[PDB]
């Protein structure tokens, strides 16, 4: 069953953008997020995400400015992944629909 997954304490460790094969007028900004301090056994140690970007409207989207900002600062996030899937390096990736920063222990356990 497809449903939205909300993740916690994830940092964006890689960012990329690739041409969207489905439509020539859109554009995919993908990335990799990792749980802070988790081991390899956990499924959150390496989660792929991708979100679409329109190529007709100029300017960086609200999603991209954060994904730019939270990348070199290595801040934790709370990513609303899903429920749709996109392609990243052949491997499937979960689409990103909402991203929120980590205030502290209260909302990022």
């Amino acid at each position, epitope marked *: *069953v*497809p*449903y939205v*997954l909300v993740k916690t304490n994830m940092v964006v460790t890689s960012v990329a953008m690739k041409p969207y094969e489905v439509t020539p007028t859109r554009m995919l900004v993908c990335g990799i997020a990792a749980k802070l301090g988790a081991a*390899a*056994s956990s*499924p959150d140690a390496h*989660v792929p995400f991708c979100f679409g970007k329109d190529l007709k409207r100029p300017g960086s989207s609200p999603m991209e400015v954060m994904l730019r900002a939270v990348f070199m600062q290595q801040r934790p996030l709370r990513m609303f*992944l*899903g*429920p*749709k*899937q996109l*392609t990243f390096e*052949g*491997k*499937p*990736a*979960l689409e990103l629909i909402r991203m929120v920063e980590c205030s502290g222990k209260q909302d990022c356990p």
Partner: antibody
Amino acid sequence: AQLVESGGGVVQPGGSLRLSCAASKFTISNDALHWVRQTPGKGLEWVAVISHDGSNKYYAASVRGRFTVSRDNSQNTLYLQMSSLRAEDTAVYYCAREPYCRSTSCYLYGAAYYGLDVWGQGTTVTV
Amino acid sequence: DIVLTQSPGTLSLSPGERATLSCRASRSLSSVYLAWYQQKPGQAPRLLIYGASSRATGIPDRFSGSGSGTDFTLTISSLKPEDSAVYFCQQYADSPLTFGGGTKVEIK
């Protein structure tokens, strides 16, 4: 739950083949489907995947851009389209149905994985 | 790219003994993303065990799974001559759905 696995294999190193899966009785619109190849040398290998509505498709490393997957719910059939096949594509091509995962991969969502359980008799494709 | 290895190879067991197969991975897999298959000579495989903890509808109550991690084992216990085939282990914890080499069981 029976599949016929139409499509026959003899092709020169550049040709193209269109293999067809067909559901006998059970409806196919609400389940995902897979293609699995079996070479007597290298064992069983995974070919491609397709979702229920066709939104998500994924392929293997060797057939990433060459092969293609299509599904038609009107005839309750699943198709595989091949680009140019080299000599390494000699194998038997099967059909699989991952039962309850409408989305292609259930490993992201954390949901339980139910394994296939419906394979067809297979078709032999060689070059 | 998780490589699943079944080290025993080919097993020759009497029609009364207990069959033990070992499937191990290069990295740890969640217990829910591993399955076992039975490939009788000449036909298509059908799943026996999924998630190493439950059986398909038509599978008889003779096959059991094992614990999670990097070691997974399947046990046949009572071994009728009907169960001479080649057994595979499959993972779906990542993008490449990788099977294993397969172990051939022989009944004397």
